[PDB]
């Protein structure tokens, strides 16, 4: 994708993440765990449902039209009826092909984006207390129990609390 | 039974924007296209591992 997260610096997806689209996996002094990220999963989901509802919105209603099958050769007028219809179908067929091509490119890039956006938010909370290991994982340079990880996941992590401990571990 | 969209082959659902059943139609109908399938992504890239 354009952002290089999904199928990029995140080396692969997690078949085991079954209650969210994006999330966290951790290891600390109390063990390891997993949690869906609620906001991003929902951010991705709403856009895809939004686009989809736009796509499946409002078919046209048509009633009396033209004949499109003919049991006799008639020439000029039939040629024209068949040409108009054939033309209409090729145009719509083109529109249909183009619409899904564009949507899918956009669906893929927006999902890559949410991953990248989630990743960036995590980095920002952590300030100087962690480093990006480059594979979508952060190394946290302080003791960080389950409540601490959860504090990161729920967006209330207070970087200042751990900064002295962390900087000491990073640089000394 | 109940259906807004009717073709000479029979009624069809009109929940999808396109159809490949028949260029002849009556009612609130998807638009006829030549393709017999068109997939709209509704998820991210799938990258399974090992």
């Amino acid at each position, epitope marked *: 994708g354009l952002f290089g997260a999904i199928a990029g610096f995140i080396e692969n997806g997690w*078949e*085991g993440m*079954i*209650d969210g689209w994006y999330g966290f996996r951790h*290891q600390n002094s109390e*063990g*390891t765990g*997993q949690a869906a990220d*609620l906001k991003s999963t929902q951010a991705a989901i709403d856009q895809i449902n939004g686009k989809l509802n736009r796509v499946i919105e409002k078919t046209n209603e048509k009633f009396h039209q033209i004949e499109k099958e003919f049991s006799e050769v008639e020439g000029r007028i039939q040629d024209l009826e068949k040409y108009v219809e054939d033309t209409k179908i090729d145009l719509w067929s083109y529109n249909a092909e183009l619409l899904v091509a564009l949507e899918n490119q956009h669906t893929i890039d927006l999902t890559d984006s949410e991953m990248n956006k989630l990743f960036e938010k995590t980095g920002r909370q952590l300030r100087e207390n962690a480093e990006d290991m480059g594979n979508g994982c952060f190394k946290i340079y302080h003791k960080c129990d389950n409540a601490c990880i959860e504090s990161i996941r729920n967006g209330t992590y207070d970087h200042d609390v751990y900064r002295d401990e962390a900087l000491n571990n990073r640089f000394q | 039974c109940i259906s807004e969209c009717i073709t000479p082959n029979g009624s069809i659902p009109n929940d999808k924007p396109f159809q490949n059943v028949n260029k002849i139609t009556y009612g609130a109908c998807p638009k006829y296209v030549k393709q017999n399938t068109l997939k709209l992504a509704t998820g991210m890239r799938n990258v399974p591992e*090992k």
Partner: antibody
Amino acid sequence: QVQLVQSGAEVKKPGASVKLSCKASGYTFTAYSMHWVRQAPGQSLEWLGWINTAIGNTQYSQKFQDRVTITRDTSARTSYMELSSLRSGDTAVYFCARGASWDARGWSGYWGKGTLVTVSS
Amino acid sequence: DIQMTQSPDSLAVSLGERATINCKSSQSVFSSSTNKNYLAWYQQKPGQPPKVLIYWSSTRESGVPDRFSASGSGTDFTLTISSLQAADVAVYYCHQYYTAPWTFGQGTKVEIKR
């Protein structure tokens, strides 16, 4: 083709130990949790515990933390459940089952055919 | 732990008729966090291992016929077999996976009424 091949039937006497195996194939092994659930005859299903297949950490049901240990061999694609100090009340079918997700917060979509273990003197 | 308790213990229904099994969990298995119910339903025929029919309390496993459906939220759940066929005669289990330990219901044996 997801498959779970469990060890053959086992008969053991009280106070002894047993170790069952579960051999997986058809899916990436370290991406799904493994669970061990038993069933006494004519009874309900009883979860014994689970193992995180990547890391290898476990947790067991408290009625079993004393005696059950769950293991995995990542190159073997295989799980192992070992029960000690067996009693007649441990006579049951022992299923291994793949979690729908590792971390155990997920149902089971694939169960092994079961291993009967009988405990009597 | 979270106790799963099914009702009724045994249920007899006529062929083609409707079958309805109920499940209550000792604590809620809904996560406001993920907006999902962590609940599953399994079928078990004698000798055979359990088979998921339904997960997320209301999602049907693939390949499972559409006559099975489940619903409910939080602590109240309901499995339904809309039009009972002979192969549906089995034991059904509900299953919470909201938290370890996994617990299951006691099981509802379902038979053909005649």
